[PDB]
Chains A and B, each alone.
Chain A
């Protein structure tokens, strides 16, 4: 409300040193088990970076580039009616949502081990193939379909 927090500075990626990558590990992290998280992020970040051949953060970026929404609808209760109005998503949010979607979808990929799942979803994303990108499509389709209010 009146408050004005902001962006809680996150500790840079250890094996690398990228703030973005760092928060990506937290999103996947669970029960405050930060170690277990990294043990999964890298293992899958490697099995993929290998195939792509290019540096992790590149294949990583590309993957996100697809699962990157530009606009989304924001609920608004104005006039005894909840009108769904779309709006361009800020830069920071874009990366966040993407990462969140990637994991949330990767976690439920029915594979064998989280690592493998993550690796796959991360790939499929880099070419609108997995569920991550799917979300963005449904979200982006939400907008425009409400562009009237936009």
Chain B
């Protein structure tokens, strides 16, 4: 997640991190793990994703 953007302009273009690393993944691995909780709690997102 690189951001050089030539030419001066006080704009962070931070949105990049918010489309890959950062939270979601970081917050995911933060605390404990799952081992079995994903194949269910995570695979239960489809039971909802259906509609």
Are chains A and B touching directly in their complex (CB below 8 angstroms)? no
Residues of B with Cβ closer than 8 Å to A? Answer: none
